[PDB]
Amino acid sequence: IQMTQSPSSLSASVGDRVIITCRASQSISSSLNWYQQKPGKAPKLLIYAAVNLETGVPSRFSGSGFGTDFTLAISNVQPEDFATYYCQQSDTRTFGRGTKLDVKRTVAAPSVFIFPPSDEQLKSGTASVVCLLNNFYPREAKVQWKVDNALQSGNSQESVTEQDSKDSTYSLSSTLTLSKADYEKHKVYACEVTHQGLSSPVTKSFNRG
Amino acid sequence: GYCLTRWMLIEAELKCFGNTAVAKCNEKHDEEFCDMLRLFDFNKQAIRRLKAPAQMSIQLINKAVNALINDQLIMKNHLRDIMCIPYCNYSKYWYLNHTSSGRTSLPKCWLISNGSYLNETQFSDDIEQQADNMITEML
Amino acid sequence: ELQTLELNMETLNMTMPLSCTKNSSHHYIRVGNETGLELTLTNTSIINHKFCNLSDAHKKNLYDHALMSIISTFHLSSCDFNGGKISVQYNLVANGVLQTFMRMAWTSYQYLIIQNTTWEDHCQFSRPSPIGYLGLL
Amino acid sequence: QLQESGGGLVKPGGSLRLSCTASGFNFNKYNMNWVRQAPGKGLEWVSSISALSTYIYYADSLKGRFTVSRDNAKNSLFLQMNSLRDDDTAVYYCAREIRRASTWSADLWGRGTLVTVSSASTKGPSVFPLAPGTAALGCLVKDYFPEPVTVSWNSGALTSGVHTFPAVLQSSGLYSLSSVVTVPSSSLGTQTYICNVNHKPSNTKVDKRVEPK
Ligand SMILES: *[C@@H]1O[C@H](CO)[C@@H](O[C@@H]2O[C@H](CO)[C@@H](O[C@@H]3O[C@H](CO[C@H]4O[C@H](CO)[C@@H](O)[C@H](O)[C@@H]4O)[C@@H](O)[C@H](O[C@H]4O[C@H](CO)[C@@H](O)[C@H](O)[C@@H]4O)[C@@H]3O)[C@H](O)[C@H]2NC(C)=O)[C@H](O)[C@H]1NC(C)=O
Ligand SMILES: *[C@@H]1O[C@H](CO)[C@@H](O[C@@H]2O[C@H](CO)[C@@H](O[C@@H]3O[C@H](CO)[C@@H](O)[C@H](O[C@H]4O[C@H](CO)[C@@H](O)[C@H](O)[C@@H]4O)[C@@H]3O)[C@H](O)[C@H]2NC(C)=O)[C@H](O)[C@H]1NC(C)=O
Ligand SMILES: *[C@@H]1O[C@H](CO)[C@@H](O[C@@H]2O[C@H](CO)[C@@H](O)[C@H](O)[C@H]2NC(C)=O)[C@H](O)[C@H]1NC(C)=O
Ligand SMILES: *[C@@H]1O[C@H](CO)[C@@H](O[C@@H]2O[C@H](CO)[C@@H](O)[C@H](O)[C@H]2NC(C)=O)[C@H](O)[C@H]1NC(C)=O
Ligand SMILES: *[C@@H]1O[C@H](CO)[C@@H](O[C@@H]2O[C@H](CO)[C@@H](O)[C@H](O)[C@H]2NC(C)=O)[C@H](O)[C@H]1NC(C)=O
Ligand SMILES: *[C@@H]1O[C@H](CO)[C@@H](O)[C@H](O)[C@H]1NC(C)=O
Ligand SMILES: *[C@@H]1O[C@H](CO)[C@@H](O)[C@H](O)[C@H]1NC(C)=O
Ligand SMILES: *[C@@H]1O[C@H](CO)[C@@H](O)[C@H](O)[C@H]1NC(C)=O
């Protein structure tokens, strides 16, 4: 029995009510459980039987639904209420994907930088080009790699950090590594960035032997 | 009007009747369903008032049996079962709802025989009779 | 129009015993959410001595009244209780014991065994219902 | 509380046992289950065992490979994993199930046990510099097998602009990250900055100085 969860992510400013939905292929009557997990912590049960509240829970955490549609409502979001949530069928014991929650702020324009491989990486031969991006919001963005006049590498590693407790910001780092023979057979390396928080896409490029 | 919740129904959530229909449960003593209502009310009262039970109350139920349920009807169903006639299982109940208006009827329990819930045709005549009752209830 | 409704008897899990069948040789009665009795048809002997003491069991006072009240009313309508456990067997009188067993569930077998067990989701198709105990009582 | 143990590192094709111990309740009467979480993914049910080990249920994606048992003398729950593959690295939990409203639910969890599968051994870290208004100096660490490798700057003096992206794997079984510090150019025009990298599994300490260009 499929257990589709909506949405992928959502941001809530303090002092608001939010809705998170769980849908299934078949009518499971009322057998659905709502769990909440903190980063690095074991998940804790919030709602059992899709309507009931467990002992030791805030009263705003409400659940409803039947048949194939279920919905969890959080009425008064608080600092300790930013985590990940899971909807689970109890008959077949299957979990979901997850909905993430974070504090909402006005857009902060990202700053983008690029760096070619250093000399030591040329000694080893693993020439690595890195594109770094600071202070972007929201989480969605898009990146691309270009080699020589134009190309699409398509083989790079991407990493994003978590929200900070002081300014509540993100960051992003992309790394592309190539062998010495492949490094020396091209001339120009560039990273392309498009951002929901940016008016125009940006290309950062350089040429090397 | 007495109503049934989602914890005491299977596949249903809120299916409930009018008080005038439930009013027949203390006049006629040939209905198979009112015993279940009496048991549900007793359970609610027991779990509400008498708090912190000490590993079940066997005597309370032993004494409520003599006061709430119809032992003659249970023995009748048992005798009908051991003598191979369609009998009652105390788990399936059918009724009429008259979806145009909303007025309903007190359920009569389903007829089980040979381990198979015999179909609506095999007792359809009874259906018609009860329909005539609502005809007599139309005025 | 005609509609059908089915009742969930597990809301009577406290204040009423519940019973349901698993196979033709196994039956289960349940008190609370942790304890119940197994009624098993078998051709294996568990105890040998031909003496059932029941007054000593109630005089022990280290027991659970709810568990053995059911077996008491079953007896009214050999044993071995050493250590506090519950274990009753009827060896094969046959007509009465089989009739009572069939009354709960509403040959070529030598014994019927009543024993203590912890609750599990045992009975496959037959939903729990209290009508059997109301009949026996 | 529930205490979980047995995790570690095992090569592909091996086998492992996980123990979960219960204290604070009557472990005899309770359904138990094992749940899984992959790195960056959501939860994933693994297995379920009944009170007297009579009914046992398994996930279909891995059927025929894990065995769940319980010894109620020690209140112990063991999971045997056989023929470990590359995607059998995760954090595992043992939860206590409960029967309410004709429905199962798990209202008590443990801490978490880490199981890693990889065909590699501890490799010496490769610490390299990344030199450039404002500038962001990078300290790039490559080809180190166990994840824990501490990064600092001047023994914690650099408390602003420090960003350590999460470690990501490699096709060779090794990891990599790049700790960055952002600052105007006065710091580099007046001082040379030191990135401290410590690889505990390989017992290496490199205090590398950036070379701005
Ligand atoms: C064994 O038998 C018992 C009794 O029949 C069953 O327990 C009952 O289960 C129902 C279904 O959940 C309970 O009804 C709901 O209980 C919720 C929990 O609150 C109660 O918590 C404690 C018990 O820990 C009680 O003592 C206390 O009085 C509370 O009543 C309530 O929250 C529900 O009320 C409302 O909840 C939501 C909140 O958003 C609303 O939206 C709903 O509309 C609803 O009105 C509701 O009361 C009932 O309380 C339970 N009774 C007892 C005595 O525990 C077991 O389920 C059964 N076991 C099995 C396996 O079937
Ligand atoms: C059969 O049913 C009975 C009752 O229906 C049931 O007994 C109850 O079990 C629950 C859960 O084990 C008990 O509730 C707990 O009691 C302890 C007592 O110290 C509290 O510490 C608990 O609070 C902690 O746990 C919560 C949930 O994990 C946390 O949210 C909370 O913050 C605390 O950390 C919790 O209240 C309850 O006391 C008993 N008894 C009764 C009368 O309810 C029994 O377990 C069922 N049997 C089986 C086999 O299922
Ligand atoms: C009904 O279910 C019971 C429970 O599984 C079956 O009893 C099992 O019988 C086999 C022998 O064929 C034993 O090996 C098992 O140990 C028994 N299970 C127990 C005791 O829990 C029984 O065979 C099934 N069928 C009938 C007709 O009773
Ligand atoms: C317990 O005993 C009964 C007999 O009272 C067994 O039933 C017999 O089984 C054999 C099997 O070879 C048949 O040939 C007989 O016809 C059966 N009936 C009788 C009256 O003998 C029963 O099988 C025994 N239990 C088990 C598990 O074998
Ligand atoms: C049925 O009840 C009896 C009586 O308590 C149980 O027998 C003892 O139970 C205690 C509590 O778990 C154990 O410490 C003893 O070891 C049991 N006695 C023996 C001789 O083993 C019996 O275990 C219960 N049945 C089940 C299935 O738990
Ligand atoms: C009869 O039909 C109405 C139509 O909405 C419905 O609300 C009601 O629950 C039905 N009666 C029963 C007893 O289900
Ligand atoms: C019960 O079974 C038979 C009687 O038919 C006999 O062989 C056996 O010894 C009896 N045991 C007890 C304890 O009565
Ligand atoms: C209890 O049963 C045993 C069975 O061997 C018997 O020896 C003993 O006398 C009995 N005790 C009584 C009846 O008080």
Output the domain CATH number for residue D71: 2.60.40.10
Question: CA angle, corner A119, sides to A185 and D189, nearest 5?
Answer: 130
**Residue B62 sits at the chain C interface (C-beta within 8 Å):** yes
Same domain for A19 and A79, yes or no, is yes
D40 token code pair: 């960056």
Residue in B closest to C12 by C-alpha: B43
Instruction: State which residues form the domain around A69.
Output: 3-103
Neighbours of D9 (CB within 10 A): 16
Per-residue exposure over A51-86, b if at least 16 CB sit within 10 Å of its own CB, e if not: bbbbeeeeeebebebbeeebbbebeebeeebbbbbb
CA D98 to chain centre: 28
Using a threshold of 3 CB pairs under 8 A, tell whether chains A and B touch.
yes
Task: Judge contact between A112 and A131, C-beta under 8 A.
Answer: yes
Interface C-D: count of C-beta contacts within 8 A: 20
Distance CA D160, CA D151 (A): 14
Task: Judge contact between A187 and A178, C-beta under 8 A.
Answer: no
A86–D105 CB contact, under 8 Å = no
Residues from chain C contacting residue D29 (CB–CB below 8 Å)? 34, 118-119
Residue from D38, D102, D43 nearest A3 by CA:
D43
Instruction: State which residues form the domain around D96.
Output: 2-117
Domain holding A127: CATH number? 2.60.40.10
Residue whose pair of structure tokens reads 């809120």 in the numeric block: B14
DSSP-based three-state secondary structure for C28: strand
Q: A103, A119, A150: which is the final residue of a domain?
A: A103
My answer on whether omega of the bond before A7 falls inside 30° of 0, hence cis, is yes
Task: Judge contact between D212 and D134, C-beta under 8 A.
Answer: no
Same domain for D53 and D142, yes or no, is no
Same domain for D24 and D113, yes or no, is yes
- Across the interface, of D33, D42, D129, the residue whose CB is closest to A97 is D42
Residue from A79, A75, A81 nearest A37 by CA:
A81
Please, is D207 exposed, middle or buried when counting C-beta atoms within 10 Å of its C-beta (0-12, 13-18, 19+)?
middle
C-alpha dist (Å) from residue A157 to A153, A154, D39, D141: 11, 10, 15, 14
DSSP letter for C83, please.
Answer: G
CA A25 to chain centre: 26
Phi, psi of A21 (to 5 degrees): -115, 145
Distance CA A13, CA D33 (A): 36
Same domain for D8 and D111, yes or no, is yes
Q: Look at chain A and report how many structural domains it folds into.
A: 2
Amino acid at A143: V
Task: Judge contact between D207 and D127, C-beta under 8 A.
Answer: no
Same domain for A137 and A192, yes or no, is yes
A120 token code pair: 């030591």
Same domain for A128 and A156, yes or no, is yes
Residue from D136, D142, D196, D203 nearest D171 by CA:
D142
Residue from D26, D51, D28, D98 nearest C122 by CA:
D51
Residue in B closest to C16 by C-alpha: B61
A40 token code pair: 């690095």
Residue from D8, D32, D28, D36 nearest D20 by CA:
D32
Annotate A23-78 with DSSP letters as a single string.
EESS---S-EEEEEE-TTS--EEEEETTTEE-SS--TT-EEEEETTEEEEEESS--
Residue from A57, A52, A54 nearest A80 by CA:
A57
Same domain for A130 and A187, yes or no, is yes
DSSP-based three-state secondary structure for C41: strand
Residues from chain B contacting residue C32 (CB–CB below 8 Å)? 55-56
Q: Which of residues 10-69 of A touch B (CB under 8 A)?
A: 29-30, 66
Distance CA D127, CA D197 (A): 7
Distance CA A143, CA A145 (A): 7
Task: Judge contact between D177 and D141, C-beta under 8 A.
Answer: yes
Neighbours of A158 (CB within 10 A): 14
D106–A134 CB contact, under 8 Å = no
Distance C91 CA to ligand 7 centre (A): 6
Same domain for D108 and D196, yes or no, is no
Residue from A80, A138, A135 nearest A113 by CA:
A135
Of all helices (H) and strands (E), which one includes residue C65?
Answer: helix C65-76
Q: Which of residues 46-75 of A touch D (CB under 8 A)?
A: 48-49, 52, 54
Annotate A124-181 with DSSP letters as a single string.
HS-EEEEEEEES--SS-EEEEEEETTS------EEEE----SSS---EEEEEEEE-HH
Neighbours of B71 (CB within 10 A): 12
List chains adjacent to chain B, taking adjacency as at least 3 C-beta pairs closer than 8 Å.
A, C
Task: Judge contact between D84 and D117, C-beta under 8 A.
Answer: yes
Distance CA B111, CA B119 (A): 9
Distance CA D191, CA D184 (A): 12
Distance CA A113, CA D138 (A): 11
Distance CA B13, CA D138 (A): 61
Interface A-B: count of C-beta contacts within 8 A: 5
DSSP-based three-state secondary structure for D213: coil
Q: D94, D117, D140: which is the final residue of a domain?
A: D117
Annotate D68-92 with DSSP letters as a single string.
EEEETTTTEEEEEEES--TT--EEE
Same domain for A83 and A134, yes or no, is no
Annotate chain B with DSSP letters as a single string.
-----SSSBSS-S-----HHHHGGGGT-S--SSHHHHHHHHHHHHHHHTS-S-SS--HHHHHHHHHHHS-HHHHHHHHHHHHTTS-B--SSEEEEE--TTT------EE--EETTEE--SGGGHHHHHHHHHHHHHHH-
Same domain for D161 and D63, yes or no, is no
Task: Judge contact between D109 and D17, C-beta under 8 A.
Answer: no
Question: Could you tell me the strand order of the sheet in which D66-71 lies?
Answer: D2-5, D15-22, D76-82, D66-71
Q: Suggest the residue from D26, D29, D49 to mutate for an interface test with chain C (most C CBs closer than 10 A).
A: D29
Amino acid at D156: G
The residue whose C-alpha atom lies closest to atom 22 belonging to ligand 2 is A55
D42–A45 CB contact, under 8 Å = no
Nearest Cα of chain A lies from the Cα of B17 at a distance, in angstroms, of 21
Q: Look at chain D and report how many structural domains it folds into.
A: 2
Same domain for D180 and D149, yes or no, is yes
Same domain for D52 and D148, yes or no, is no
Same domain for A130 and A49, yes or no, is no
Q: A103, A121, A148: which is the final residue of a domain?
A: A103
Using a threshold of 3 CB pairs under 8 A, tell whether chains A and C touch.
no
Q: Give the number of whichever ligand sits closest to the CA of residue C41.
A: 3
Ligand 5 near C48 CB (within 6 A): no
Neighbours of C47 (CB within 10 A): 14
Distance C85 CA to ligand 5 centre (A): 6
Nearest atom in ligand 7 to C78's CA? 13
Question: CA angle, corner D81, sides to D76 and D85, nearest 5?
Answer: 155
Residue from B57, A204, B55, D131 nearest C64 by CA:
B55
Same domain for A124 and A52, yes or no, is no
Distance CA C15, CA C37 (A): 17
Distance CA C109, CA A80 (A): 63
Same domain for A95 and A120, yes or no, is no
Distance CA A152, CA A74 (A): 43
Same domain for D39 and D132, yes or no, is no
Nearest atom in ligand 6 to B102's CA? 1
Of all helices (H) and strands (E), which one includes residue A184?
Answer: helix A180-184
Same domain for D60 and D153, yes or no, is no
The residues near D211 (Cβ < 8 Å, ≥ 6 apart) are D129, D131, D192
Q: D67, D83, D117: which is the final residue of a domain?
A: D117
Distance CA D14, CA C82 (A): 48
Nearest Cα of chain D lies from the Cα of C79 at a distance, in angstroms, of 24
Task: Judge contact between A8 and A96, C-beta under 8 A.
Answer: no
Distance C118 CA to ligand 5 centre (A): 10
| Mutate-to-test residue for ligand 3 from C21, C25, C43, C123, highest number of ligand atoms within 8 A of CB | C25
Task: Judge contact between C37 and C29, C-beta under 8 A.
Answer: yes
Same domain for A92 and A125, yes or no, is no
Ligand 2 near D30 CB (within 6 A): yes
The residue whose C-alpha atom lies closest to atom 9 belonging to ligand 4 is C108
C118–D29 CB contact, under 8 Å = yes
Nearest atom in ligand 3 to C23's CA? 1
Q: D57, D86, D117: which is the final residue of a domain?
A: D117
D183 token code pair: 């600052």
Task: Judge contact between D176 and D133, C-beta under 8 A.
Answer: no
D172-175 LR contacts (CB < 8 Å, sep 24+): D172/D120, D172/D143, D173/D118, D173/D119, D173/D120, D173/D145, D174/D120, D174/D123, D174/D142, D174/D143, D174/D144, D174/D145, D175/D143, D175/D144, D175/D145, D175/D147, D175/D149
Residue from B130, A173, C34 nearest D176 by CA:
A173
Give the total residue count for chain D. 213
Residues from chain B contacting residue C7 (CB–CB below 8 Å)? 8-10, 36, 91, 93
Same domain for D110 and D143, yes or no, is no
Q: Tell me the structure's resolution in angstroms, rounded to a single decimal.
A: 3.1
DSSP-based three-state secondary structure for D107: coil
The residue whose C-alpha atom lies closest to atom 45 belonging to ligand 2 is D98
Nearest atom in ligand 5 to C116's CA? 1
Q: A103, A137, A164: which is the final residue of a domain?
A: A103
Residues from chain A contacting residue B6 (CB–CB below 8 Å)? 30
D51–C121 CB contact, under 8 Å = no
Beta pairing class for D104-106 and D134-144:
unpaired
Same domain for D48 and D74, yes or no, is yes
Of all helices (H) and strands (E), which one includes residue C59?
Answer: helix C55-60
Residue from B106, B71, B70, B74 nearest B90 by CA:
B74
A30–B6 CB contact, under 8 Å = yes
Same domain for D18 and D113, yes or no, is yes
Distance CA B79, CA B85 (A): 9
Distance CA A121, CA C132 (A): 81
Distance CA B127, CA C40 (A): 41
Distance A33 CA to ligand 1 centre (A): 15
Q: Across-strand partners of C19?
A: C29, C129
Amino acid at A150: A
